[PDB]
Amino acid sequence: INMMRGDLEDNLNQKRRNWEKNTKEFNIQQRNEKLDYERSSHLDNQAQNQYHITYC
Amino acid sequence: MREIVHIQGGQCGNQIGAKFWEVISDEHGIDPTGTYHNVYYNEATGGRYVPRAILMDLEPGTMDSVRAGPFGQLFRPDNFVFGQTGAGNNWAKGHYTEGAELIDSVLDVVRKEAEGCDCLQGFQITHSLGGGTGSGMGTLLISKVREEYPDRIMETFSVVPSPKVSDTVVEPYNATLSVHQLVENADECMVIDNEALYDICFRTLKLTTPTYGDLNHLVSAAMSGVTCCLRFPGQLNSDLRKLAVNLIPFPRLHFFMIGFAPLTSRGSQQYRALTVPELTQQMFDAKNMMCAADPRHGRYLTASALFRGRMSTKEVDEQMLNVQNKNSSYFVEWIPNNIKSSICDIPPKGLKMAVTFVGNSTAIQEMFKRVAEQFTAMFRRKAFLHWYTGEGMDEMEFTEAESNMNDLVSEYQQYQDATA
Amino acid sequence: MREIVHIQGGQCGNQIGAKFWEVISDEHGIDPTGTYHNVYYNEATGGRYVPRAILMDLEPGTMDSVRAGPFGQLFRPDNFVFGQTGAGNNWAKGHYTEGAELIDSVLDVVRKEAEGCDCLQGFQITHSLGGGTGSGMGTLLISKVREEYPDRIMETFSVVPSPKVSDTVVEPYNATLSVHQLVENADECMVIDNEALYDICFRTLKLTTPTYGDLNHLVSAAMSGVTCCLRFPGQLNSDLRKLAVNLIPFPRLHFFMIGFAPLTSRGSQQYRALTVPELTQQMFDAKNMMCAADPRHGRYLTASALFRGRMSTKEVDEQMLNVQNKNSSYFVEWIPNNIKSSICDIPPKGLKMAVTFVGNSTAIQEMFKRVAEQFTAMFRRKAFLHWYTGEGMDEMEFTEAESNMNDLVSEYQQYQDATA
Amino acid sequence: MREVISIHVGQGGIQVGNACWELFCLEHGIQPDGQMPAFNTFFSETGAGKHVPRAVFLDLEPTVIDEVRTGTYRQLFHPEQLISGKEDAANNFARGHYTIGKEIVDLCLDRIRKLADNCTGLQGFLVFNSVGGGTGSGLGSLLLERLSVDYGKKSKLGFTIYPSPQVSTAVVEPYNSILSTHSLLEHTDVAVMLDNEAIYDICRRNLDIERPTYTNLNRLIAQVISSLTASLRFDGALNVDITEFQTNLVPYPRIHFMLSSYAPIISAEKAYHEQLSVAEITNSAFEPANMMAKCDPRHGKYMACSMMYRGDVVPKDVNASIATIKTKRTIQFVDWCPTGFKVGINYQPPTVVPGGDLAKVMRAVCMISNSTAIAEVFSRLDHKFDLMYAKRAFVHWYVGEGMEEGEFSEAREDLAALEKDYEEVGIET
Amino acid sequence: MREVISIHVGQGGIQVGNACWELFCLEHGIQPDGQMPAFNTFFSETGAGKHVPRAVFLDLEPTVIDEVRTGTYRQLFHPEQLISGKEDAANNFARGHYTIGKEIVDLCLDRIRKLADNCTGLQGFLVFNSVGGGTGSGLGSLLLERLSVDYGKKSKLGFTIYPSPQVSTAVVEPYNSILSTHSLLEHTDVAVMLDNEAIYDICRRNLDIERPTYTNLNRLIAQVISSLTASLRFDGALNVDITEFQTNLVPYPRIHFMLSSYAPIISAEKAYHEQLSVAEITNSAFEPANMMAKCDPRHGKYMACSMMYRGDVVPKDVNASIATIKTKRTIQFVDWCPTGFKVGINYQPPTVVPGGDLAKVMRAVCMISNSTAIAEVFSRLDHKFDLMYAKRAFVHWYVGEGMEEGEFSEAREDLAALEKDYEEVGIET
């Protein structure tokens, strides 16, 4: 019974670390999508500025 | 013969009851279907076994909390007395206006469960002490059924406020209001704190994710080990009344403490053997009790040790005599041999020994003293009083409640000093 | 029966204790898994043998090490009571500040260890004198338990500072404090010093790369041989007390010297004969002991010798009487047959004869003169005192401590001159 | 068998409600069409197929109600809970309290009654009113009074966007804010002061977005609302029913104005390099810097503090962390409340809004603090009032709409009498 | 469980800290990506994989902090533990201690608190700051006062870069060095004087490189720091914690200014040639040619010597060599300290930084010494002070920043008293 309890708690801790690494995957994806967002918005800003200034 | 109607109530009551019926079903070898593979269950057509427990509350969410969980389909749906309005965490709400004009249905259910028995012995309630619906409906039901069935006995496994930091901010008020209804209408009341359970699960079993499920499991195991010496054979069998007579010297010093043994971690289990001196060494330890009141700060008016499994009674008696004569200070004297023993003949599911320790100590008075501070410091400023007043509650009662509490702690203070 | 609680403590204490339990596991044929393939070990489930020992340090470093090295599974984790703030070579820091914060749990576990015994004989300690953790914590523990257990004896296998090159610069302060404490509540301050171990390892074993492993193994061998004539059959048995009574004529005169025999290299092993005359030649030579006090520059108030091996008896006594009545100058005169002997029946693993030679001499007065002199030279300028006063202590103790130290040697020299 | 009813009056209310219904729909798996590809607490099934929300959306300017009538959720709300009049509030209280609402309150109350007729376990109301405006102030207070005289016992919370301390969004604000505060004193049991100044600060520092906008603000407000309602909605080892707050945090009958806080509101990166356990999360939850409202709790006492945890949380760390945080000396409570803590636990980890700046994390805490430092805010706000009432500025736009002038005086003085409570309760026994 | 905080304030402090953290990431085997393929003393695991270092970087000039934010270690540190100001210190101590020092030091204390709460057995503090700098003195002293009034019992050991008596990199070093010395006199328990000149002649006599650059200096200081902390980091025969140092080498609470030394210091050309025996390595450790502080130890008399060996070490020959050194007539201790040597041993050789001009070798000795000759430095340094305060040179730049004019006198006066004690100890009895 001691061996079984040890094995079960080991598996539970493994599941914990697995979910933690899942959340870290998600966080890195979030950061990179935010960088995509900001660069695309910068190019859109340059586009609107050209459109407004060349408006003679 | 000698049945038990287990009543629950409130959040803590419902959760502890869920885990408790799980443990009981495990003991008697049942599966969640309710078939085997009188003291607790009842037979039903087709060999089914339905628990003899009514479940009550003012908020129908806790039902779906306990019902959907495993070992849930047992409780008969004709017993979930769940008012569809709300509780609100307030005593007068669940005792005078809202959680009071429903008690008639609860009495109906209790009567249909009692008059259908042959020789009912005692009621066994599990509930919180500051929770609005829990404490309120618990004390109201206590008053009613105890004014109704005096032939039987009463037993309540309450949970006290977490001493260090609270879990609700109005807990002293409701705790005192319940205490004033307990000492007048009860016959056996054990107390448990959600604080010492943390210290145990973290320094006795080396757990890292202690879920309320596991703490409830510990409490329920203790509750089952208490009465395990009744529904099973034994070299010397006890009950719910042999305690009630070998423990309380006076009609009010009836607030006990609970301890379970053995509880061991992984390595600590690898290194220690199962021999009753070890179980005794673990039993009396202050860090091993479910009540956040270090007994070293007091003495034991009495303490009953209900063993389980199979062991030479001479070993038990030698351990009792040695622990009593050696710690001659931590025991009071005017009651000679103030420790009682009992031996059933069934070990737990997966051990060789077992010990339940129910101790009427004069050390828990300190806890009450603590409450006697907080309530007092929340009454001269009339803090939060208008919510309770808004339900017709006469503040006068509050006063006597505190007064009552005074006498209670005063009682203990008169005895740990008594000499002869 | 006649059990022994081993108390570790300090970095040196932890290392020497690891080596000691290694040597005991070797002798009693215990592999480092914990099985066999009561005087020291305690039985546990499945024939496991858990060492009756307790480790302690205000830092979890050396504890982590000995739990990582060999034989790290033996000691139970309940006996690793360890703080995490560290002491840091400040006797006051480990005797007045953190002493009161950990000594509670240490006494708790030591009580649970002693009561778990049936008939305890004595204690036995391994610590240093300069390092704050070792000296402070160990001597506070000794104070507590000796004020707790008055009848049983003590045993301090204490490593004094080396004379020439210290390990710490504030060493003399902790040394004089620990020697003013242990002189009052301890029966045997068996002193050990490193430089003599180095001289041995270069002169009598030829190991030119002396690592602490070998020194610890040597002191481990001596420590094991101390009590071997108890846990084994014997032609003439002894114990921890027969020594303690044949050794100290006056309770203050209880600071011994140690010696082990025989010691040989690999080359010398083939040729050197193993008979009691050459064992005596070794055990009664100056460069063979483990003390910074030339035994030829003092005398012996008494000296006992525990032999091991199935050898004759008349020749043992004859060589003892010869060694005495030959160097009657180098011995004291007013006492008759100042040399006590004892004989066991089982030699250690790897040899056929063995001698543990312990002696209550009066040559260590040189060591205590050196320590007192360093104390004066470092105190008469208040050097390094603003630590030993920021931790709740006035210089008074120091002076009076040193004062007591003086009286100590003031007796030794005196008895080296009396003639009758 | 348990649910709420949310009202979103005014202009800010409908905005935060748009964001909050976005979050709710995208948590319960309810598509913006009302069809699924727990909701009994918020939504309700129309017999079969699609969900409909439990809400009412009032305004007087047809702008925002139209924008949501043809936005992305044109086919989610029942077209009878979107009540828009003809004229505008124009930031003067009496316009939305005596003339315009004079009959619109009838339709609103009839619709609220028809909603409550269908609710089965109704607990309370969650209004949303930017008191700085005209309609959310006037009509909001009128609706509050009407509900309090109509139903009664049912609890009534609130989430008001008070005027910021420093930055300006209107000039007649201290009038229609003081009037709303005086008309809100008794009928509402819970006021949760939200201020767009502190959340701008946060979005600037912690969320790293330098150019925020009410969109992100309202995303965060919706997150707070959902982290508070998760107790009723989903399962939790220790749940609270909103009637909890009505009795844990209202010591004296008049004083109930509290401030909210949330943690951890951290960007992706600033959380990626972070262990972020319960200890740090709660030692940051108490931080005065990142409070939703604006005040200096280090300069005042605390009176009650509820904390709802959500996500995979270990209770032992909760207990130890609250112990060590009550250990601190800079954070002190008043004499008449020694057990100054309340906790709840929900097993539902926080849901992230797809396309939201907030980062996903397992453990989160939501704090509702009844303190006594927030008192000064009123004073400061009251301060402004005097500098306008010293010369009867802007009063004709109010007396022209039937509002008796003396009302101002009363409120301005009676609210000042509110101080008699605060500066008293801060004094020990 | 046991760990140290690492603070790097100033310019030189931050560069040498960059080198030190490079060495620390290299030894344990941590990549600059944060992911790794003993670190409890320095690093902290981020739940899953990555590691954050216990460190704060204070400097009011963004340039170096911008460099580290865009250097090779942009991914390791936490994006908040890189705290940058907006203006230079300008080498006038008052600038980083009165005017702007009040602005950022509170943020440093916030971050330090939030970094220490997530620790359990913290022991000390290792601050790194050139004294000649502006913020390396002002902000450093302010932070030290804050930490002293905050924590207390926790040890504190700076590693300051004192200006050489000959080489000059500024013209106002005396002023903002005297000021920070008078501030740090009673705050930091153990201040190791690390000079910047003697290292040049060291790396010209041993490493044989003719034109050395600051980066080599920082790598060597990093080597010394790692050789120090290896005891708590790793295992060994004689573990010596950090609280050991301030216990052995502080005879009187005021005289604690110690000078260090390191060996072996040799490049590859003679590495295989020379034998580097324990006796010869500890002999080279004591020769006055390679003491980091520019002093001839023969001038004075030692008071305490802590020698830390790491790698393959045989204690017998260690004791023999130490005895020979004790018998050398060129070195001698004061009379009142007969036990002069404290020794520690470890079980790990050094590690080499790719590009580090040093060579790999099994044995390493780092020997720190509390001595007396170091006194003269102050004297000569104090010398300069006179020839500035005799004409009030550069004083107005200080008086214009709030600092009182006459305060200098006090500081100067105090250092004189310091010198007093450095003669009250060298006298026999």
Ligand SMILES: Nc1nc2c(ncn2[C@@H]2O[C@H](COP(=O)(O)OP(=O)(O)OP(=O)(O)O)[C@@H](O)[C@H]2O)c(=O)[nH]1
């Ligand atoms: N949190 C949040 N606050 C807002 C938002 N929009 C406006 N506010 C605040 O609400 C106040 C604006 O006053 P309004 O609500 O527009 O005035 P009104 O009562 O609606 O009167 P009418 O415009 O005539 O309908 C200002 O304090 C705003 O800061 C939003 O989208 N989110």
Ligand SMILES: Nc1nc2c(ncn2[C@@H]2O[C@H](COP(=O)(O)OP(=O)(O)OP(=O)(O)O)[C@@H](O)[C@H]2O)c(=O)[nH]1
């Ligand atoms: N050991 C070492 N010292 C350095 C290094 N870089 C600069 N220093 C020293 O820094 C001192 C110059 O003062 P700074 O530290 O630059 O001034 P500050 O207080 O940091 O603020 P600023 O004036 O903005 O630079 C000189 O004495 C340098 O010797 C380095 O890389 N290693």
Ligand SMILES: Nc1nc2c(ncn2[C@@H]2O[C@H](COP(=O)(O)OP(=O)(O)O)[C@@H](O)[C@H]2O)c(=O)[nH]1
């Ligand atoms: N060990 C344990 N304690 C609980 C549990 N549920 C509630 N408690 C206690 O319940 C107390 C709050 O009062 P409660 O009865 O839940 O409020 P009510 O049910 O709404 O009347 C708290 O002090 C909790 O400690 C549980 O599941 N396990």
Ligand SMILES: Nc1nc2c(ncn2[C@@H]2O[C@H](COP(=O)(O)OP(=O)(O)O)[C@@H](O)[C@H]2O)c(=O)[nH]1
């Ligand atoms: N014979 C021997 N003596 C040791 C050994 N290790 C340490 N010692 C001594 O132990 C003393 C240090 O005492 P201690 O309290 O354990 O160190 P601390 O924990 O840092 O305070 C030193 O004087 C060392 O000389 C060892 O391995 N063998």
Ligand SMILES: [Mg+2]
């Ligand atoms: Mg508007």
Ligand SMILES: [Mg+2]
């Ligand atoms: Mg700089």
